[PDB]
Amino acid sequence: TSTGNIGQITLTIGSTTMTFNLQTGENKIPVIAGTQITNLTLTSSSAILIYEEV
Amino acid sequence: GQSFPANAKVKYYYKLSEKQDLDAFVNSIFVGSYKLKQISYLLYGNTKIVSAPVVPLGPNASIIIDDELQEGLYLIRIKVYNTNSFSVTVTPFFNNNNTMTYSIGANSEFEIYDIFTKEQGNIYYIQLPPGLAILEFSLERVFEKGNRINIPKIIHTSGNGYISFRLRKGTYAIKMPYSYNNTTSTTFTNFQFGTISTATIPLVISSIPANGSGSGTFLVYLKITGDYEDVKFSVTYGGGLGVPFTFGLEVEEINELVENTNFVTQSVTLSGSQVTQSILNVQGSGSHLRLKYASVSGLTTAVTQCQLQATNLNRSTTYSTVWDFIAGGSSTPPSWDIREINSIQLVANGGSSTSSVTITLILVYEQIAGELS
DSSP states (O other): OOOSEEEEEEEEETTEEEEEEEESSOOOOOOOTTOEEEEEEESSOOOOOOOOOO | OOOOOOOSOOOSEEETTSHHHHHHHTTTTEESOOEEEEEEEEETTEEEEEEEEEOOSSSOEEEEEOSOOOSEEEEEEEEEEEOSSSOEEEOOOTTTOSSOBEEEOTTEEEEEEEEEEEOTTOOEEEEEOTTEEEEEEEEEESSSSSOOEEEEEEEEESSOOEEEEEOOSEEEEEEEEEEEEOOSSOOBSSEEEEEEEOOEEEEEESOBOTTOEEEEEEEEEEEEOSSOOEEEEEEOSOSSSOOOEEEEEEEEEEOOOEEEEEEEEEEEEESSSOEEEEEEEOTTTTEEEEEEEEEEEOOOTTEEEEEEEEEOTTTOSSOEEEEEHHHHOSBOOTTOOEEEEOEEEEEEEEOOSSSOEEEEEEEEEEEEESEEO
16 A cells, blocks of 8 residues: 555575565566575565566 | 675665665665664654664674765765664764764664765765664755754763864854763863864863763854865863763854954053063964054153064964054054954063053954854
């Protein structure tokens, strides 16, 4: 019901870990096959939709 | 000892609850990791809720800015919130400080004030302890749109510390409200808290009673003619002493203050040898003089020397003569006006010691706010 910074996501592939800032709306991150979504933490209850454009 | 990515352009304002700002912040000036949390705090009864970065358990996070910002004197403001249930300290940069501190209460919002002069590759640096939530970081130039530095009474010293900054031409008031607590049973009498300099002005309290506490305000002025623009404040007392002070800082441009103007009188009696008699000396006070009129009565042919001399003591200690009552007459003419001066003396000679002549000087002068450089 708000806008702005809402949390974080962590991704891992192989021997790399990456942490990203999340805002309301779209967040778009290039990824390679096999990447794992290991954590997400939001600051307020939200609807969460995760998909991949291939 | 850690490593950080710094590719992004630095911004002059960040609201770290906004993704973009935070992404930039943490790819340019932030050192360490963060956890995003929901932070809330009270404003007039209402509870503000944001998501902002939080420094985690571990080593302290730092903000470091070596980027090529526009040159100038910056007031920094970083809004924080202490999520810990214990209080936490921070040590502001102030250009040269590494011992004075702020104290941030448990469970509370706090504004950290900091001063950064961007010249000669200076690099801003501050550490932030675990459990502090960073909400906003602001860099603004002061002395811009008639703004001033105005930090409230929150800075903690226990005897050492420095703050530096750059002032362009002008006359400035430096106002430092303070509180102290003397834990010691010594009772101090011409207590030098510290100095302001470029020229040096001591900040002195008349009396600090044993086992006492009190409050006051130093108020001092600097005339920055422009060739020496960097001012250094130093807390100089003790360290071991056991008199913790807490103070604020306010630096602001003023238009000129005639503090007073006075008619003053001085007799000198001559008995055969040279006397040099100090009239007023105002060096180190935060002011300077302007002489408007001078006269001497009681001159006779028995007086061989009678010269008023003046200098800016912060530029030369050798005075030069500013009127000669023998060579020129017993009183100054209408265009006589002596400016930029700190100290005045009469040097005279004559009489005998079988006959002493006594002359008397009168002098109108103004005392004007600002130490001369």
